[PDB]
Design a protein around this ligand. Structure first.
Ligand SMILES: [Cl-]
Ligand SMILES: [Cl-]
Lengths: 29, 29
């Protein structure tokens, strides 16, 4: 899985949010 | 990378936190 901004890529589903290095990200798997 | 409760697995590094389903997770890579 990956933390992404602004959205997941094709095939992936968002499962909440990452808190990483002072930013918020979509958690995508 | 993965979001895990209660902790990352040995070999992984905790890079931050996830929020998903009203819970706090370790963000592990
Ligand atoms: Cl920001
Ligand atoms: Cl991953």
């Amino acid at each position: 899985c990956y933390c992404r901004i602004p959205a997941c890529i094709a095939g992936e589903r968002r499962y909440x949010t990452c808190i990483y290095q002072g930013r918020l990200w979509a958690f995508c798997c």
